[PDB]
Amino acid sequence: GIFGAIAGFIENGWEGMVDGWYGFRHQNSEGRGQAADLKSTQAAIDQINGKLNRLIGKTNEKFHQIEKEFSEVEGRIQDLEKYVEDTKIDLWSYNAELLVALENQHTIDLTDSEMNKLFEKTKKQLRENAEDMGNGCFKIYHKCDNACIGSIRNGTYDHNVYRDEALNNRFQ
């Protein structure tokens, strides 16, 4: 991925997370748990559904056309009819090949981006109370119970509440 998160500084995915595409795993004093992040999951799904919406169920109507199979040798005109159809099929086959390759590259990059976005969002939320371990995990330098973890996942974490405790543990 072009952002370096998925298959990057995040070592691997979680087969155990089945209610979301992105999420949090925590270990604190009350145990260890898992929770999916709905907003980032929805953001990736909406973009992929936007791709599907303009590729699926959008066929054009064609009716009377040219003949494309021939039982007799005819020469010039039949050569042109065959050449016209072979030309068209090759150009559409090229369109289809390029389309899928471009879309898949973009899909991998956009899902990698959503993972990086959630990581950056969480990092800025923690301010001076945590340090990036480099593998997608934050070392939080204060007691952070389940309500505290839930406040980070909900976006309501107030870093000033724990700042004095965290700075003391960080900078010994």
Partner: protein, 317 residues
């Protein structure tokens, strides 16, 4: 002690390989197929009006081959021409056969209106044992084989004005006798002329006498021609022999009708897209079933499969 908060993403045990700009094989959590590669094996009779030609080609249904009498005045969105179809009337050919078949198929109708031509002085309704209808010698239902009367073939000069608001399609022909004996026997003179004209067009045909290989014991041949008469114009037929006369005109329309060669059976189902292999679903944008299609169809491509990634890269364990 503190806490650890880890950010991550899901993964699946059954990933799917897709292609990208940089990699021909990369595994994502899920994908969807963009190439339809199967048909249900039958042509659904909805929503397009299907006409199964059975043993009849469209041209044979047009001329009035005896096995095609049930097709008189029928209409269609798609005429399905079977590969088993065969002719069983007087031996004939059509110069530019493909164009007549195309324009009739595109018109989508075999509506025929009889007209009373003044064939004064000749014998009408010639028949042949090569064209049996009801155990008797007969002929193309829409054509009139004119021959001599009392060993006289007086020159024909007949008009038929188009006072309608639509175009008329006239089907007529020229008989090529196998021998000069047959030419005398049928038309009472050594050589015929046929001139079919309007204010916009003229067609002149001379018969070509000679032996052709026999079909149903007939060494002669008929050549089929057509003429379109615009409203306010007039059809003028001027002949001194060998004329295979029309019995009227076909309505010629414009629309979405066409013809398809197929051996697939007709089924009672609904499908927008028809191929000679049968109907195919049209949810996917591409297909590799058949380059011949009718209706709202995916575009034909050479690839048998194209997987569109619908999930992130799969990174298990």
């Amino acid at each position: 002690p503190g806490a650890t908060l880890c950010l991550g993403h899901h993964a699946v045990p059954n990933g799917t390989i897709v292609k990208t700009i940089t990699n021909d094989r990369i595994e994502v959590t899920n994908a969807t197929e963009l190439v339809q590669n199967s048909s249900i094996g039958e042509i659904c009779d909805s929503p397009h009006q299907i006409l199964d030609g059975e043993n009849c080609t469209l041209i044979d249904a047009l001329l009035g081959d005896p096995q095609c009498d049930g097709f008189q005045n029928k209409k269609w969105d798609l005429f399905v021409e079977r590969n088993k179809a065969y002719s069983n009337c007087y031996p004939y050919d059509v110069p530019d056969y493909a164009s007549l078949r195309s324009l009739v198929a595109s018109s989508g109708t075999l509506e025929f209106n009889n007209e009373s031509f003044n064939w004064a002085g000749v014998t009408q309704n010639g028949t042949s044992s090569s064209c049996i209808r009801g155990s008797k010698s007969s002929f193309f239902s829409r054509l009139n084989w004119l021959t001599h009367l009392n060993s006289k073939y007086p020159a024909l000069n007949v008009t038929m004005p188009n006072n309608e608001q639509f175009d008329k399609l006239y089907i007529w022909g020229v008989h090529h006798p196998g021998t000069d004996k047959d030419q005398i026997s049928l038309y009472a003179q050594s050589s015929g002329r046929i001139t079919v004209s309007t204010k916009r067009s003229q067609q002149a045909v001379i018969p070509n006498i000679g032996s052709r290989p026999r079909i149903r014991d007939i060494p002669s041949r008929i050549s089929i021609y057509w003429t379109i008469v615009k409203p306010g114009d007039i059809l003028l037929i001027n002949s001194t022999g060998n004329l295979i006369a029309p019995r009227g005109y076909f309505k010629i329309r414009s629309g979405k009708s066409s013809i398809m060669r197929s051996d697939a059976p007709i089924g009672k189902c609904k499908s927008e897209c028809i191929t000679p292999n049968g109907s195919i679903p049209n949810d996917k944008p591409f297909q590799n079933v058949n380059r011949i299609t009718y209706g709202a169809c995916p575009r034909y491509v050479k690839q048998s499969t194209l997987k569109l990634a619908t999930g992130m890269r799969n990174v298990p364990e």
